[PDB]
């Protein structure tokens, strides 16, 4: 399962990357999602996941297995065969699997959310042009070397708009530390010994 997770993570990342790909129609992206998911499912690890899912469907057997595990580990011989950590892991094997599959499902949900973002775009006139422009720019972006800081900190030729001017360094604006507030704040380290005669009968 530790590798089922990675397989689905890579599938999701590839789908997200290809969504930025301009060549895809809405239909092509839906097709890519469906086919990537099916291909992932048909690999060996995918079949492991599918068998796990079928067992979840027929939950009676998994519950019976966990009950049997509880019975097994209570036996004295268990303490001799396995140290406590191993016994704990074997006891909550089913819990660990049921939790682990959640990451597969979460990557799947991430891909589905992204295709939702892409699908709904029944654009209008003004938007459509800049949409194509941005997609082209983003497709240009992927081929850069982002891990190199120099590439990240290159200076783009964009126009200066929203140009703010501030802090004209007029000499007059200066002012100076007014340390004349000399009054110390007194210390209080007195033990407040109390007499009980002030509370009522």
């Amino acid at each position: 399962f530790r590798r089922v997770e990675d397989s689905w993570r890579e599938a999701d990342r590839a789908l997200r990357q290809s969504i930025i790909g301009e060549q895809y129609h809405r239909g092509d992206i839906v097709e890519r999602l469906l086919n990537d998911q099916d291909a992932l499912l048909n690999t060996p690890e995918g079949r492991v996941f599918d068998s796990f899912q079928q067992q979840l469907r027929q939950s009676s057997e998994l519950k019976a297995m966990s009950e049997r595990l509880r019975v097994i580990l209570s036996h004295p011989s268990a303490s001799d065969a396995l140290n406590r950590l191993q016994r704990h892991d074997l006891r909550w094997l089913v819990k660990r699997l049921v939790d682990e599959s959640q990451t597969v499902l979460q990557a799947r949900a991430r891909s589905e959310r992204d295709v939702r973002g892409f699908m709904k775009t029944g654009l209008a006139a003004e938007h459509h042009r800049v949409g194509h422009l941005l997609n082209e720019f983003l497709n240009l972006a992927l081929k850069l070397d982002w891990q190199r800081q120099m590439i990240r900190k290159q200076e783009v030729p964009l126009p200066a708009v929203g140009v703010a001017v501030t802090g004209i360094p007029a000499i007059e604006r200066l002012r100076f530390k007014e340390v004349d507030d000399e009054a110390e704040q007194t210390l209080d380290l007195s033990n407040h010994a109390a007499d009980l005669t002030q509370i009522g009968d």
């Binding site: 809405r26 839906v30 699908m119 709904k120």
Partner: protein
């Protein structure tokens, strides 16, 4: 989204169908009125003969 796309295509297909049916009549009309424009001269030549 897919359902609405299907409905949109179902609606638009007859538009193109009728548009072609209409371009056919447009061609039926243009050359025919050109033939009408040519009729007087043909009849003039035949009348001269």
């Amino acid at each position: 989204e897919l359902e609405t796309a299907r409905k949109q295509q179902q609606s638009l297909q007859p538009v193109a169908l009728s548009w072609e049916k209409y371009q056919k009549q447009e061609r039926q009309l243009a050359d025919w009125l050109t033939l009408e424009s040519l009729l007087p001269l043909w009849f003039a030549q035949q009348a001269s003969h």
